[PDB]
Amino acid sequence: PRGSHMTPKDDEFYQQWQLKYPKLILREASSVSEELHKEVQEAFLTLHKHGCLFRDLVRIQGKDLLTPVSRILIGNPGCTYKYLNTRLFTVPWPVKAEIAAACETFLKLNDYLQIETIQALEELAADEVDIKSRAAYNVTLLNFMDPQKMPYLKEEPYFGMGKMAVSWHHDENLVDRSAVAVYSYSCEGRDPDIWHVGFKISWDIETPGLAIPLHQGDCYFMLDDLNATHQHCVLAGSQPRFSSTHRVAECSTGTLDYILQRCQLALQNVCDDVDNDDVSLKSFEPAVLKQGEEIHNEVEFEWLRQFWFQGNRYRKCTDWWCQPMAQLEALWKKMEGVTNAVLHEVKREVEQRNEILTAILASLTARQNLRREWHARCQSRIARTPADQKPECRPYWEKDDASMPLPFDLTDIVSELRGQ
Ligand SMILES: Cc1cn([C@H]2C[C@H](O)[C@@H](CO)O2)c(=O)n(C)c1=O
Ligand SMILES: O=C(O)CNC(=O)C(=O)O
Ligand SMILES: [Fe+2]
């Protein structure tokens, strides 16, 4: 009921770490090459100067909020990482010129950490494919903050660890039991002026948490189920700091290949001799239409609106997604055309044959709600606060637009479907 935490200044700290955090590894700067250090530190600097790191206008727990920390997702080409309901797209790295050079740097840093991890994971066990898979980092999220540009920072509420740049949380959307590697770059009770990473047992508020000091060049690893059993935070220092958190993102349903295939799957129900607006369906089996409208929603809100909300962003560091994102829109547009098709069938010249109503009604109302939601987050008050960062509500078109088969809805079509 006093608020305490532990640091290496305490006696119990070492027995707490060894007996209650055996899966938390720390490798001090003195263990990593100076050849690697300077290179990755130079990378954080070019990328920062180039303005590739932005804070995200997230909508956590129903509220629109800008994030104190600025970040950049770098990793396998075609891969994405969902973080706080927002889906970040990877600026690609050389998976078999400055911005391109840095991604090369963070690629070797990745290989490095990967090695450090499998090793430490083997030393821990004291199959071998589980180790390999759980340390196979496919992405790295880079972060940055300060110099205290924050008017007032929130104070850690449980162990008096002082100010914090990132509150207690778990790294989510990761492969089960996957490890996480962090390279900390601090460019200059716990010492207020130094960055630390906080730790605590989930649900546990009375076991003093650990605040481990982070100096320029230090790396820490979270192995096995540690990330799931414990929460961590990042207590703030006085200087600004960078960091690259390499992870193994659960990317089933999360790569360009996956979503492209999903599209080809839905369009298998449309005569594909030519690409015009006389879209005809091979069948109106309530089940196939279900899957068709579901994929329509998936490519629309999980990919298109998600990509454009970040507005002109990754484009300042990569063009990689321009054409694939242009193709998903073409694909989606064709799907708007299948919707109109189904709509023409349902209300045309049998009547139980309206299994085509209780098979697409759920997906259409969802397309309705999610469209308002996104349109709102776009022309919202907070969203007025950079020019090249402001969210875009694409795909968007005015009711008076001829090229689109249906309107941006607003219902009427949805209401009318209640009919019966
Ligand atoms: C769940 C979760 C949260 N945060 C950060 C976002 C903010 O910086 C802070 C509070 O949401 O935690 C984060 O960086 N990752 C990778 C997560 O998986
Ligand atoms: O910077 C760190 O040490 C840890 N950062 C994070 O929590 C993160 O990137 O999600
Ligand atoms: Fe984290």
CATH value at residue 362: 1.20.58.1470
Regarding whether 278 and 181 lie in a shared domain, the answer is: no
Radius of gyration for the alpha carbons in the chain, expressed in angstroms and rounded: 25
**Any known ligand binding at 71?**
yes
The letter for the amino acid at 260 is: L
The Cα 285–Cα 215 span in angstroms is 62
Asked if residue 417 belongs to a domain, the reply is no
The Cα 208–Cα 158 span in angstroms is 9
Q: How many domains does the chain fold into? A: 2
Asked if residue 310 belongs to a domain, the reply is yes
Asked if residue 406 belongs to a domain, the reply is no
Regarding whether 187 and 168 lie in a shared domain, the answer is: yes
- Buried b or exposed e, range 54-92, using 16+ CB within 10 angstroms: bbbbbbeeeeeeebbbbbbbbbbbbbbbbbbebbbbbbb
List the residue whose alpha carbon is closest to atom 7 of ligand 1: 166
Last residue of a domain, one of 255, 276, 311: 255
Regarding whether 295 and 224 lie in a shared domain, the answer is: no
Asked if residue 396 belongs to a domain, the reply is no
Q: Which residues does 208 contact at the CB level (< 8 Å), separation at least 6?
A: 4, 5, 6, 16, 159
Q: Which residues, listed in sequence order, are joined to residue 89 by a DSSP beta bridge?
A: 80
Asked if residue 415 belongs to a domain, the reply is no
The Cα 343–Cα 211 span in angstroms is 59
Strands (E), 146-266: 164-169, 180-186, 195-201, 209-214, 219-222, 230-235, 241-247
Regarding whether 243 and 105 lie in a shared domain, the answer is: yes
Which residue precedes each gap in the chain (C to N above 2.5 Å)?
A: 96, 126, 188, 349, 385
Regarding whether 216 and 285 lie in a shared domain, the answer is: no
Asked if residue 286 belongs to a domain, the reply is yes
Tokens describing residue 33: 């090459």
The Cα 92–Cα 228 span in angstroms is 28
The Cα 411–Cα 367 span in angstroms is 10
Q: Which residues, listed in sequence order, are joined to residue 243 by a DSSP beta bridge?
A: 143, 184
Eight-class DSSP state of 268: G
Regarding whether 352 and 296 lie in a shared domain, the answer is: yes
Which bound ligand lies closest to the C-alpha atom of 84? Answer: 1
Regarding whether 367 and 326 lie in a shared domain, the answer is: yes
Q: How was this structure determined?
A: X-ray
Tokens 């960078």 locate to 242
* Cβ contact 54:389 at 8 Å: yes
The Cα 410–Cα 420 span in angstroms is 20
Last residue of a domain, one of 203, 227, 255: 255
Tokens describing residue 190: 């716990």
Residue 180's nearest CA partner among 130, 225, 236, 215 is 225
The Cα 200–Cα 163 span in angstroms is 16
CA of 245 to the centre of ligand 2 (A): 6
* Tally of residues, the chain: 420
Last residue of a domain, one of 208, 230, 255: 255
Q: Is the CB of 197 under 6 A from ligand 2?
A: yes
**Any known ligand binding at 258?**
no
Asked if residue 403 belongs to a domain, the reply is no
Regarding whether 136 and 235 lie in a shared domain, the answer is: yes
- Identify the CATH number of the domain in which residue 237 sits: 2.60.120.590
Regarding whether 233 and 150 lie in a shared domain, the answer is: yes
Q: How many helices (H) and strands (E) does the chain have?
A: 11, 16
Regarding whether 277 and 211 lie in a shared domain, the answer is: no
Q: Is the CB of 83 under 6 A from ligand 1?
A: yes
> Left if phi > 0, otherwise alpha if psi is -120 to 50, otherwise beta: which for 212?
beta
**Any known ligand binding at 232?**
yes
Regarding whether 104 and 31 lie in a shared domain, the answer is: yes
Regarding whether 274 and 232 lie in a shared domain, the answer is: no
Sign of CA dihedral 29, 31, 35, 36: negative
The Cα 198–Cα 223 span in angstroms is 16
Asked if residue 329 belongs to a domain, the reply is yes
Q: Which residues does 186 contact at the CB level (< 8 Å), separation at least 6?
A: 194, 195, 214, 215, 216, 237, 239, 241
CA of 233 to the centre of ligand 1 (A): 9
Atom of ligand 1 nearest to the CA of 68: 8
Q: 140 is in which domain, residue-wise?
A: 5-255
* Cβ contact 267:335 at 8 Å: yes
